[PDB]
Design a protein around this ligand. Structure first.
Ligand SMILES: O=c1[nH]cnc2c([C@@H]3N[C@H](CO)[C@@H](O)[C@H]3O)c[nH]c12
Ligand SMILES: O=c1[nH]cnc2c([C@@H]3N[C@H](CO)[C@@H](O)[C@H]3O)c[nH]c12
Ligand SMILES: [Ca+2]
Ligand SMILES: [Ca+2]
Ligand code: NA
Lengths: 316, 317
């Protein structure tokens, strides 16, 4: 197993990603998580992370791990309508089973001591073996670590597997002020993304919309979780997919961390537009000589991923 | 002992909580049919969720199967698209997709597909041996269609209509550039049909307007109590729906009254509906017309009684 830290922002797919990482203990040792006030309100995202962790800890061999709220602030906030989803999950029956909330109330204070950005730096730098960071929210926290510690941090990262961007397809940030070329995780904090994508010392795998677009979440698939209601994780994952849209963005990204068979990768030099322009947050190919490479996921194995998640959701 | 009830709903989350409340209380309520309207739902999804809930309950608490119809009613003023997708979400929920339950729904779905809800409502009421209570949790289009078609032949077979809709002495919830905020959505969706219903002399009406429903908020701690009951399919179902929903229990409170009238005392008010294209289109207003029919408006509902009733009902299976 390899050490993994989940750096997430508390939306539905972030939590599916969490379940995928945590359930696959043969491949993944989940040593920490941080939650950012991006596509959630951070207190709800924090609480849902804890409730999921406690449910799993009480039902399978999943060690407890530190959970930290990130101090990162938005450059461009997510729509309020999407940010409420962690609040909904916080109230779900599956996450409010007596034995699990009792545990979470008990261990909450220890996790309240953490600040997410510092926790990420510490977990990576203090690890004996290198750490894979799975980033399913904005890149603010990885950038903070790079800015503060530089090579002391980046040399300890096995790879940064990132959900974000849109390279050779349209983005998903459609606002009166934008041209639709940017993707939301990057748009939330463009400068931090620029720091991450341009860092020569960091290995990066990028699940941009180019790959996530090709793995739709369809109703008959979601309904298959209904065949598994004796498994708590299947109630959980099925419920979250049922509440979500048509994509599995962050879950696909986490699936790759579990098993790289999920997608092939192509090296591309990726820059980020940080200017206050219609294309703010766009991830763009750059011709600059010696610009660092990012390994962009291509043609993901949709069926393999979908099977992986269904199976993983039988862990408990 | 049990009284005949038909649920006339539009497939939002509280409509389905209402359905569970009616169906789970078999001592008091014999649920003889349901219809779904293409209002605060896409009707195919509301139809499927109704079937899936009924089948789950049939297989786990012996709830008798009943006809489910889709209404052909069309909006005068349609609900926002962003609210109408919730039945689609529910249709994909694990709790509603357990194989034994879905196989039962698959077996009986085609017979239900063939109904048209408006005629179904008329037939269920008129062909019943005993009088029928109609619990209306969407727009009033279907009750109006029956009154228009059959008049006294229909209304004489109705025990009462228990209606979620309107706003009498409080503001509404229809907030548009063209409105003054005094109308409530179920009425605003089809004002003319609501007018027909509230002005009908042959008919006992109980009205849960925003006056009463505003006073029973659905809060996180209460919703989280369903987590104590995850051994019950209905607690997973109801808790999930409240967790997904907004701040109120509109239709569920309305159904609770059908189960037990101690939910609220009522106040007779002559209710007219504004149908002209004015800022308060869809408003339920007091009318001073002589000998105008009375509607019994719920006042000061028993919140704790309701909250307890629902937690208990959600332990039926
Ligand atoms: O429509 C949406 N609802 C909730 N979250 C997202 C996102 C978030 N941003 C990423 C995909 O662009 C992914 O991490 C997801 O959590 C994009 N679009 C939506
Ligand atoms: O936010 C809302 N505004 C207006 N109506 C509703 C509803 C539906 N409309 C009715 C309350 O206006 C009730 O029957 C409910 O099912 C849910 N949420 C809202
Ligand atoms: Ca995310
Ligand atoms: Ca309704
Ligand atoms: Na159909």
């Amino acid at each position: 197993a390899k050490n993994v830290v989940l750096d997430h922002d508390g939306n539905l797919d972030d939590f599916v990603a969490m379940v995928l990482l945590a359930s696959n203990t043969e491949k993944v040792r989940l040593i920490g998580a941080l939650c950012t006030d991006a596509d959630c309100f951070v207190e709800n995202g924090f609480n849902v992370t804890g409730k999921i962790m406690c449910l799993m800890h009480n039902n399978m061999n999943l060690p407890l791990f530190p959970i930290g709220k990130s101090a990162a602030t938005a450059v461009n906030p997510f729509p309020k309508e999407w940010r409420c989803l962690a609040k909904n999950m916080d109230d779900m029956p599956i996450l409010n089973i007596p034995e699990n909330v009792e545990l979470w109330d008990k261990i909450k204070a220890e996790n309240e001591k953490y600040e997410g950005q510092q926790l990420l730096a510490d977990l990576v730098m203090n690890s004996e073996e290198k750490v894979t960071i799975c980033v399913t929210g904005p890149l603010s926290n990885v950038a903070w670590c790079i800015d503060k510690y530089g090579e002391k941090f980046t040399s300890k990262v096995e790879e940064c597997v990132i959900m974000g961007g849109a390279v050779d397809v349209r983005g998903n940030v459609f606002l009166p002020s934008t041209d639709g070329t940017a993707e939301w995780n990057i748009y939330w904090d463009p400068a931090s993304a620029k720091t991450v994508f341009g860092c020569p010392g960091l290995r990066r795998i990028m699940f941009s919309l180019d790959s996530t677009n090709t793995v739709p979440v369809r109703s008959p698939y979601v309904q298959r979780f209904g065949e598994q209601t004796n498994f708590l994780l299947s109630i959980l994952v099925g419920t979250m997919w049922a509440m979500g849209g048509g994509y599995a963005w962050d879950a696909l990204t986490a699936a790759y961390v579990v098993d790289q068979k999920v997608a092939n990768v192509d090296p591309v030099p990726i820059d980020v537009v940080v200017d206050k322009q219609p294309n703010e947050g766009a991830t763009v190919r750059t011709d600059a000589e010696n610009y660092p490479l990012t390994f962009v996921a291509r043609n993901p194995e949709a069926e393999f991923f979908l099977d992986m998640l269904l199976r993983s959701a039988r862990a408990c």
